[PDB]
Design a protein around this ligand. Sequence first.
Ligand SMILES: [Zn+2]
Lengths: 39, 41, 42, 40
Amino acid sequence: EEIFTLQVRGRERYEILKKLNDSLELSDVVPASDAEKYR
Amino acid sequence: EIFTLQVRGRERYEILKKLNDSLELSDVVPASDAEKYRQKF
Amino acid sequence: EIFTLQVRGRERYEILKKLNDSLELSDVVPASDAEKYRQKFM
Amino acid sequence: EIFTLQVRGRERYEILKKLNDSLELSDVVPASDAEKYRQK
Ligand SMILES: [Zn+2]
């Protein structure tokens, strides 16, 4: 897959953005119908 | 422990809804299951 | 108009609020003005 | 300090870039100037 890079200033911001990235990754691979059941 | 956020405009709403929905999702999918879904696709 | 969002937790709320305010700022500052700030304060 | 964040896929890269550029802009715009732009 097409891989990209971002420079992030500050450690807290990196932690926040790394969490968003990982969260978005999971949402992309969980069918919406599975996701409504987990909710 | 609940707050409501005011969002001005549709484009910001969709971005911020998306992020919020995604974080909540990570709070309710089990670690082993999340891994399965990432392996699969 | 106005949309509202139910956010769970103080920490998550502060993060999404900061993001909201940052996107707002980005929308009303011209790119030309942005680069002037990015160059002079960094 | 500076960190490098790897992202897979165009969709996600664009969203995260948008957020990160936004965060950085608000680190260099004075509080006073920021509220003037919001009022304008
Ligand atoms: Zn399971």
